[PDB]
Amino acid sequence: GVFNYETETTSVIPAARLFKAFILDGDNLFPKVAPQAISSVENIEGNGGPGTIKKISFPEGFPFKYVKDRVDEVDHTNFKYNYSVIEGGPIGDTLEKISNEIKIVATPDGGSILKISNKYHTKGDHEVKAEQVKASKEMGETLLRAVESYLLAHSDAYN
Template identity: 60%
Template sequence: MGVFTYEFETTTIIPPARLFKAFALDGDNLIPNVAPLAIESSEIIEGNGGPGTIKMINLGQRSQYNYAKLRIDEMDNANFTYGYSLIEGDALTRRPEKISYKFKLGAYPEGGSILKSICKYHTKGDLEIKEEEIKASKENIARLFKAVEAYLLVNPEAITK
């Protein structure tokens, strides 16, 4: 087994606390509404929403996959850090054993936030992760991020601190 890692970074004018709440705390309700082609629904099937919680994600028409089960690995509200692992789903069929994501939001010097994302593919055997898979994953993260950002910009009363 090997681990393949890539990073992704982007910025927004949305403050870190609001963006963290939108993604990590209210994401199960918000994301299916702002990006239904990516995620149709999300529900907690075990746990209380904190670390150890298992979620069932039904993926949308834009995805080549149908579902994913995620486990929340870490959630730090004070430091705006959220980590989870894809532990089951058709995306893992003959693919990595698991895929782990960690997001960290920080204050951007000109205002707003900087999002840093680290993705780790825990592979089985000699499986190699292809560059087009990495590119597609980065594009999906960026698209989802921009959808949430656009929603928050046009709905200033939604997801407040």
Template identity: 60%
Template sequence: MGIFAYDFETTSVITPDRLFKAYAIDGDNLMPKVAPLAVESSKIIEGNGGPGTIKMITFSKGSRFKYVKNRIDEIDNANFTYGYSLIESAAFTGTLEKITYEFKLVASPEGGSILKSICEYHTKGDQEIKEEKIKSSKAKAARLFKAVEAYLLANPNVYN
């Protein structure tokens, strides 16, 4: 098995606590609102919302894949860290075992947040992940993060 990783870092004017509540804690409800062309729904299919919980994200019609299943690996409300693994997807097609994501929000000196994220592709056998796939994943992550930020800016009284 191989592991192909990338780091992603971006900033926001939103405070870490608000971003964490929106992005990690209430992401199931928020994602269909901020990315309706991509995410149709997200629901818990096993567990209570804590580590070990399995979520199924159904993508909107016209998406390349119908759904994915994620497992929550870590939630730390005090330190604004969240980790999950994508454990089932049609995208795997014999190439991937799983994809893990970890992110941490920290306060920036300007009063907003810094998102620090690590993504690891765990491949089967000697499969490799192409650089184009990593670039595409980074771009999607940035768009989703900025969509959440835009929603919070437009709705200053939510997730306080």
């Protein structure tokens, strides 16, 4: 079945720039700005749209070795990005997939709001634990704050 988790967070970076950097260039940025969170991102297949497969490796000592993520949808107009965790890490005989939807919305102060949904698809029926949702939220927040710091410091990046 499906367990749905939703959260929101804010950024001081305008929505379009944040989307271009944090979403569209995460493969480059995450290992650069947050090497103690993500060791590397490998493009396995695909050119960035629906179906593109990436292997995300975690640093030594992390709970999981890697995950493979699949791009589901990329909406450049509405700053929506959907992707799924489809192999590795928590995926296996109790958890088939984690489907994620991110939307970035502008705020009038010049920042943005990020709306995040994480949908865990289980076999039957293997309760999803608060600790696992917390870890995903914490990773996302770490990556966001690292990218935000980089964007604040490199004004000519991603305009």
